[PDB]
Amino acid sequence: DDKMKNIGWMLRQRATVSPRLQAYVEPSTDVRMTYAQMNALANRCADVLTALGIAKGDRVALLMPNSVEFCCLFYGAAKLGAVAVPINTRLAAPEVSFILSDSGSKVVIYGAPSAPVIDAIRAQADPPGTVTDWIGADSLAERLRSAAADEPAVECGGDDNLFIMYTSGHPKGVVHTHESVHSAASSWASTIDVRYRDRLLLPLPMFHVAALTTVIFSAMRGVTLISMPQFDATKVWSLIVEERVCIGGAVPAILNFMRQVPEFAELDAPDFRYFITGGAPMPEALIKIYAAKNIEVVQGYALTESCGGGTLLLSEDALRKAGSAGRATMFTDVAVRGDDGVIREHGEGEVVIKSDILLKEYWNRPEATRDAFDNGWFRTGDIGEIDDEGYLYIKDRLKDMIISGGENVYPAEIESVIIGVPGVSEVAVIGLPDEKWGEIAAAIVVADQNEVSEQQIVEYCGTRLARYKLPKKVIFAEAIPRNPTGKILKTVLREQYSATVP
Ligand SMILES: N[C@@H](Cc1c[nH]c[nH+]1)C(=O)O
């Protein structure tokens, strides 16, 4: 009986071990709920979904702000064997319409901030045809008020589908199961220093895979979620103090802003131990200033396809291994697949993952699914290097890969050669559109133009790189666009140089 492997039943079990432990605290909306209350609201959510015709395998799209309803809808769907489709509320109406059609969502639950997108979608001549119900905030709240908190007969779990999350032309839907979600939650919970009764600040959207995994591992470990649905750097330290927060989810921008507000210098947070951050590596200067406040930083690497698991750079290693994405986590194997097709745990190549945290499939894309795997190893499309001690360094992401005359070219391959040229101080490589090649690799170079010439860089590149990998344009710039935490902004580069191509 797969109920024992059901994420919604897991919540019920946390509500049995620790019924009176705080589960969800959102001071902005005055929500302070125990695990027993959260389980009861999940049951009410399940009752509401049942009432709407949702059965095992049916998709319920979620387009709403962070809230305990978001969590309990997810849990409620889990108990029913339904499949949640959490949608990014920043997407425009055509992208949301695609997702609804592709997922074949039956019910759409939307927040008030998303009413304009839903309105635009429902106004189409032929809206997504599978949607039988569009349920906004007021309707959901009224339904919840009259629902019974009966525990559903839960008879699904394990490898049963649980959610579809879209990742990007058109996105693909990444299908996760009760098993993958549980594995990812276990992976985090067994790898990071998380403790029974820890209080964890979530100030990132719940439609991001890592935030979803955070919600689930919180129930798994008995952690209280402290919710900040709209991040405000001028309000976050107060919240961290008032709610005795132990761990916080963040990204480097957030931690940078949090360092600049008056509260950083002024409030003391003795219970706060570390942030878990996603995104580019944290700058050393930021790691150090947080370390002076006795706060550590955990970093890592994950994808939608890995349910937010993958590698973690533990606190002890943040400075030691600046720029690393860390080591493989519990329940995850991570390696690199060479140009030769050999998978190795040490060296350079395409990052590959083998783990129960992996997606079951891309939704209604069986060939894409097969092509993404090599003997159980998921091919990320990202390139990196694993050092002799097992630390992963990401070199380039799939999103920045260039297809030039049908050949794949990653920018880091070129950047790491050109940065070597004497007189070059910085280099970033992007693809620019091209009638002939589709995209060409353009090197944007900051250099002493008295010492360095375009011809010299290209003829120098011709020394280390196959001919098809040579930059087809070299562009000298006085500056490359970077964010305050020092990440090269390739999206800005592409915008800047759109004026140079037809
Ligand atoms: N080994 C089970 C454990 C589990 C899943 N969900 C809740 N518990 C699985 O991952 O499928």
Curated annotation (Swiss-Prot):
The record marks 214, 302 as: Important for substrate selectivity. Pathway: Lipid metabolism; fatty acid biosynthesis. Homodimer. InterPro entries: AMP-bd_C, AMP-bd_C_sf, AMP-binding_CS, AMP-dep_synth/lig_dom, ANL_N_sf. GO terms for cellular component: plasma membrane. It is an enzyme of class 6 (ligase). GO terms for biological process: fatty acid biosynthetic process. Required for maintaining the appropriate mycolic acid composition and permeability of the envelope on its exposure to acidic pH. Catalyzes the activation of long-chain fatty acids as acyl-coenzyme A (acyl-CoA), which are then transferred to the multifunctional polyketide synthase (PKS) type III for further chain extension. The record marks 12, 20, 195, 197, 244 as: Membrane interaction. It is found in: Cell membrane. PANTHER family: ACYL-COA SYNTHETASE (PTHR43201), MEDIUM-CHAIN ACYL-COA LIGASE ACSF2, MITOCHONDRIAL (PTHR43201:SF5). Keywords: ATP-binding, Cell membrane, Fatty acid metabolism, Ligase, Lipid metabolism, Membrane, Nucleotide-binding. This is Long-chain-fatty-acid--CoA ligase FadD13. It is a peripheral membrane protein. The gene is fadD13. GO terms for molecular function: ATP binding; long-chain fatty acid-CoA ligase activity; medium-chain fatty acid-CoA ligase activity. Belongs to the ATP-dependent AMP-binding enzyme family. CDD domains: FACL_FadD13-like. The keyword ATP-binding applies. Its main location: membrane. Its EC number is 6.2.1.3. It catalyses: a long-chain fatty acid + ATP + CoA = a long-chain fatty acyl-CoA + AMP + diphosphate.
